[PDB]
């Protein structure tokens with residue numbers, strides 16, 4: 488609606504957002520897309536990393552991000568009689584009885 | 585009768601030392617339960633090598649750890665270098681199931697974690713933000729669209745449409761186990777003679 | 779040294795250095811109810827109810843002596859359970875605070891990356907962290923450059 | 928601690944060069960490592 492283009496959306500087969508090779512120095516996916524101008528744009532959530540920004544141009548950001556720790560809530564602790572009489576053995580309890 | 589005195593003194597003695605030993609055992613158990621810190625933040629998992637942690641394999645997360653200089657993040661980097669074939673997964677859902685099944689921590693996008701915790705009650709977000717970056721749209725070098733893309737992103741940010749669109753789219757414990765036993769003791773105290 | 783090598787100075791009329799300010803943790807609450815912290819109002823109300831019940835029991839025992847000894851022993855061991863639980867809880871969070879080691883060194887702040895730290899931008903502190911050769915202040919410089927804004 | 932050089936000597940200028948030389952090389956750091964070193968007897972270890 489802003490720029491007025493006939494946008495075409497299709498899929499890639501490279502399977503990665505873009506990563507330089509460790510010994511070859513070769514990228515893949517969106518980075519080699521925008522080096523060779525195979526497609527004009529790649530609308531994907533991509534962080535503004537300076538290694539990618541020194542290769543291809545990057546736009547100004549529209550939303551923030553952050554690496555966060557993912558975990559669960561493994562909480563039990565059933566409030567019962569057995570939890571109340573926990574720190575002594577029941578054989579000791581019946582021997583005292 | 586000195587026999588009754590001896591029996592009462594011995595009975596008070598062993599009842600008091602059983603009560604003291606039970607109090608000491610419960611104090612040690614509660615102190616261990618308090619000392620067991622359940623917080624597993626960035627400073628906690630720097631040295632906790634028992635709990636596995638990592639990220640999606642060859643993503644932007646350890647790319648930030650490729651150039652990290654903080655010794656906690658260097659510890660994370662050395663741990664994922666030591667166990668590269670195990671704790672690294674190709675997709676997000678593999679790490680999600682690794683967190684749900686095994687003792688695993690996963691380091692990925694906070695908005696995705698927020699959406700997953702919105703749609704699943706079985707997961708939590710702990711700690712804060714390790715980094716602080718933004719989403720930049722991928723453009724070729726020297727792109728004439730990219731200037732117009734930057735102007736359009738500024739216009740949509742000043743309009744606030746992206747923020748409200750992101751708002752709509754992809755957003756007694758142990759003391760409680762005490763008074764039940766006391767109520768049962770009250771029930772047994774009622775059923776004596778009345 | 780950059781300011782001195784650019785332009786001349788006078789004599790330093792006083793000598794100072796860079797140190798660390800932290801907020802003092804005011805986690806202590808009024809001593810009143812402080813020993814009631816291990817105690818539980820809710821279980822406190824429950825024990826009040828239990829005492830009321832024992833009173834009603836004794837009343838019916840005469841208005842409905844081995845049974846009096848049974849009721850007194852049950853109430854006595856019930857209060858002993860209360861005393862042992864409260865003493866265990868109170869010693870537990872008494873040993874929570876005293877086992878804690880607070881911040882007392884710059885190296886502890888270098889290890890603790892949860893607590894944020896920094897200084898004034900374009901000051902002598904970041905100049906000294908730029909010219910820092912000790913690895914502790916180098917990691918300080920790496921942290922404050924990481925949280926650059 | 929310093930050196931009591933004669934006044935106007937080039938030893939003061941040599942020490943002034945050496946100050947920046949040791950600061951840029953971190954010689955006080957390895958001096959603290961080497962000679963203010965625990966050769967046995969570390970700090971007060973709390974035994975329970």
Ligand SMILES: C/C(=C/C=C/[C@@H](C)C(=O)O)[C@H]1CN[C@H](C(=O)O)[C@H]1CC(=O)O
Nearest residue numbers: 781796897898899900901902903904905
């Ligand atoms: C508090 C303070 C802030 C400096 C801010 C920067 C933006 C500046 O004014 O150059 C000053 C006080 N005098 C010091 C100085 O400039 O020598 C500086 C403190 C510091 O450099 O750490």
Ligand SMILES: C/C(=C\C=C/[C@@H](C)C(=O)O)[C@H]1CN[C@H](C(=O)O)[C@H]1CC(=O)O
Nearest residue numbers: 503504532533534640641642643644645
């Ligand atoms: C989940 C995700 C990517 C998925 C797989 C990785 C291996 C990749 O191809 O970058 C995205 C989410 N946004 C991040 C970005 O801005 O690139 C990225 C996270 C990551 O790469 O670790």
